[PDB]
Design a protein around this ligand. Structure first.
Ligand SMILES: COc1cc(CNC(=O)Cc2ccc(CNc3c4c(nc5cc(Cl)ccc35)C[C@H]3CC(C)=C[C@@H]4C3)cc2)ccc1O
Lengths: 532, 532
């Protein structure tokens, strides 16, 4: 009865799940779209046709077809991110965690996983929503969307492979929530979408896209924003990459109709196996198939829409991690290792910045190098290692997000900015990697509340402060409970630009997060590249 | 007898001078050239034709025709630099202080005054050589040369105004020393030339010029070097400024000879009054009539000569002051005042950068601005003032000199590098201007040994260290006395790049003098301006 819910698409049967020392309801693997299989590959998704009977929704759905990281087999630090379920092109499902007993009209949060737009799963351990739903009395939804070529191949002009269909996948899940969340105790007029990395940029892209704005109330962006350099491409580049994807598979390249037909004949892993051969340069933090600026989902360039205020006016809560770049240097840069301190030589450093700013000309490379090199101590392996990390994280995450937050605040209705700089007491990665890309998700999702996971007492407390900020923001548009005796997270304004740290210590308020480096990244370096 | 000396050109009668609690010999205003007057204006100097009888040499000579600074009339701090004798085109004289009794063969130091190549006199109080001749038992010479258009108007191709005749004035005095200093007790085989500002660049230019290399032994350069941006021009820009000086005074511009004839009819102050009107930009630390890269004095470009090693190989001692730029901001930049602390607004800062890097495009100015702005505190008037100060000093003196120091040390036979950062306890200029362009000369010349000048006991000891450094270096090529247990001024090498502070505290050895900012000024900015 509590577990049996009738939706506009059909009946669904959930399952009772234990959560700490209590229980809540879970609805797992609910379909929201028609499977994008066969001739529906590279397609705009179509709504799930209603079903008769009762949908068994007690088990996680499949994961979408994606690259699988096999660098450290058996290593929990890397495999906690890989698909923990069978992969399939039939993957467009969503999951819901409802408090027990079921609320009447409670706040809804909708998780959007990240992963460079080429990977990601709704079913990972760190995305399990029971702790959040149960602790903050919210209805927690995690959606899914097609990644890699399956969701972002873009042959603009074709209605058959138009691009951005993975973004339409998320839009349609949010439409489902809009149409059905009431039957689970959720209030569709108070829906918060939130995501990390490509999920965070996705969230920002729904803030921008007119066809998405009315499908949610407010937004949380973690280590990602729509203007990121890795987050979108022109139709010309997206076309070039799709045409090049065919050339790698001996496809006929004369018509989109022929190219699309050829690529529809390929097994999923055939596309995945050559997915990276299509990038223009040797690079890190760069991905082949990503959203496109198409004049449709995005009416104009991301920057003109930001200048004109052409976007959803609401409240946003967003932030970054202290060492966003370390994960990428480990995997793609010379001199970095999981098992050493990864002191970086001068020769390696130069190769690093080349691989980090792959679009820059020789003058631009000098500019980056000069801004991050202490020429009293240029052979210092550690300053060179830490410099390269800052290069990667500033260029790709921090400074793109800061440009977004300053532009948005000029028109929005409330900004809250955080800096997550706590290193987990139980990290499995070496100490040089710092506060890693994606390792705040464990605290947002309350995993430190599980005593067997061996977080410290202070980390359980930090994870509860964070969950409550997120939830209170989702409920009210403000992370702070007014009238409460707690330290207050201040609003980010255009003039004072305040933000807080997130960590185990009492709160500190700072101003102008990485202003110096981000003036370089957001104003000087593009002006130098435009000229030259 | 001690004061009567026979030279290859005629007899000279000196005078017996008091110094501290003793006396020495002084020969003032000895002619070394024919008066470059009338039809000889702008021409190469001619050797002074011998005279019969006894030249009265007990009186300072005339000063050369030059701009006279009247900003602060009566103020000792600016008027100590103005001509203290009558001005005249008949100004090619030299002065000699000789210890008493006369030594047999003793080291010779030849002083070359600075002043932007448009001003400067051999006869100023701070250049009075008795203290240095007496305290260090050297024969001390101060020469003179033509400045302004009189010394450096350049119409390459013409033999009537070929350019660089001011440098040639210096060369001829050096030739006279080589020919006569032995009669005053000086060893012509151990002559050290030294000068500040334009005088330091001049010393450097004699190191480069083949026709000068044999006329001296070793060199000291203070707050100036031949590759400074204000220190030379092309033949085209010299001709351009010459033609414009003509246009400014309604001269026939048809031919070099008509133009030269017209200018030779003008009174001296007629030329001076329009001297500034020929500069290409609104600028500070830029001077109209300066040496020319002509192909004869300088065989090729200064950089090629520095690269090929085409220069005199010997020992050099050289350095800079802490705040070279404040004097020029006082006189030519908005917001600076003699009587206030001159906190600089952001608008005046921007106006400063433009006047300071007049040859930069907009990308260059943003580069300078970014490099010297603290964007956590951009409305700090002190930080803005001190930034503008560093921009002027680094771009015009410190970084130009460090490039010379590095290039020269690769081929030279001994470099010694100093950083003079003591601020005199009796300065008449405000604290914000720091250690000023020019104000190390007083310590080099031992003015702190005069009790009436109200220096501190520790400044007299500093001045004595400096005099002994200079004289010892001149005597031996090493500022350090052997087998003394005083701290040793380390040789500057290609790889360790050590230098010393000069102040009242015990000496410390540092490395890489302002290497961060000078990578920008010597390697990045020129590359950016060449690319844009
Ligand atoms: C656009 O900017 C402007 C720039 C100027 C330039 N100002 C001048 O030429 C005036 C001037 C000022 C001073 C001198 C000679 N005096 C000095 C000299 C030196 N340092 C000084 C430091 C101070 Cl604080 C004051 C005077 C010094 C150090 C030596 C180098 C020079 C160039 C001149 C001598 C000797 C000559 C000429 C005038 C008006 C402007 O608007």
């Amino acid at each position: 009865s509590e577990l049996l819910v009738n939706t506009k698409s059909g009946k669904v049967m959930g399952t009772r799940v234990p959560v700490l020392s209590s229980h809540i309801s879970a609805f797992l693997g609910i379909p929201f779209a028609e499977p994008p299989v066969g001739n529906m590959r590279f397609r705009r998704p179509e709504p799930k046709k209603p079903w008769s009977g009762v949908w068994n929704a007690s088990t996680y759905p499949n994961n979408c077809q994606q690259y699988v990281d096999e660098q450290f087999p058996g290593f929990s630090g890397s495999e906690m991110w890989n698909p923990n379920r069978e992969m399939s092109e039939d993957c467009l499902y969503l999951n819901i965690w409802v408090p027990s007993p079921r609320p009447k009209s409670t706040t809804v949060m909708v998780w959007i996983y990240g992963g460079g737009f080429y990977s990601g799963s709704s079913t990972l351990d760190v995305y399990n929503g029971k702790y959040l739903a149960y602790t903050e009395e919210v209805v927690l939804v995690s959606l899914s969307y097609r990644v890699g070529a399956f969701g972002f191949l873009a042959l603009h002009g074709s209605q058959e492979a138009p691009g951005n269909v993975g973004l339409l996948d998320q839009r349609m899940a949010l439409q489902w929530v809009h149409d059905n969340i009431q039957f689970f105790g959720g209030d569709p007029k108070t829906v918060t979408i939130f995501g990390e990395s490509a999920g965070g940029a996705s969230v920002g892209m729904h803030i921008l896209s007119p066809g998405s704005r009315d499908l949610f109330r407010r937004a949380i962006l973690q280590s990602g924003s729509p203007n990121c350099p890795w987050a979108s491409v022109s139709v010309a580049e997206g076309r070039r990459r799709a045409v090049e994807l065919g050339r790698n598979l001996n496809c006929n390249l004369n018509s989109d109709e022929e190219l699309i037909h050829c690529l529809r004949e390929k097994k999923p892993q055939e596309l995945i196996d050559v997915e990276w051969n299509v990038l223009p340069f040797d690079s890190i933090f760069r991905f082949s198939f990503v959203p496109v600026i198409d004049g449709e989902f995005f009416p104009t360039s991301l920057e003109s829409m930001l200048n004109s205020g052409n976007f959803k006016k609401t409240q946003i809560l967003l932030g970054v991690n202290k060492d966003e770049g370390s994960f990428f240097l480990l995997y793609g840069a010379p001199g970095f290792s999981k098992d050493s301190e990864s002191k970086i030589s001068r020769e390696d450093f130069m190769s690093g910045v080349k691989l980090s700013v792959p679009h820059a000309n020789d003058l631009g490379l000098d500019a980056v190098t000069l801004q991050y090199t202490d020429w009293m101590d240029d052979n210092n392996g550690i300053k060179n290692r830490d410099g390269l990390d800052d290069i990667v994280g500033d260029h790709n995450v921090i400074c793109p997000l800061m440009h977004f937050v300053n532009k948005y605040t000029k028109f929005g209705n409330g900004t809250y900015l955080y800096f997550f700089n706590h290193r987990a007491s139980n990290l499995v990665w070496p100490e040089w990697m710092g506060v890693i890309h994606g390792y705040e998700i464990e605290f947002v999702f309350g995993l430190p509340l599980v005593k067997e996971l061996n977080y410290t007492a202070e980390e359980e407390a930090l994870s509860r402060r964070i969950m409550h900020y997120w939830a209170t923001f989702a409920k009210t548009g403000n992370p702070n409970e007014p009238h409460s005796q707690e330290s207050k997270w201040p609003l980010f304004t255009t003039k004072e630009q305040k933000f807080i740290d997130l960590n185990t210590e009492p709160m500190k308020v700072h101003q102008r997060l990485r202003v110096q480096m981000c003036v370089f990244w957001n104003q000087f370096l593009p002006k130098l590249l435009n000229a030259t």
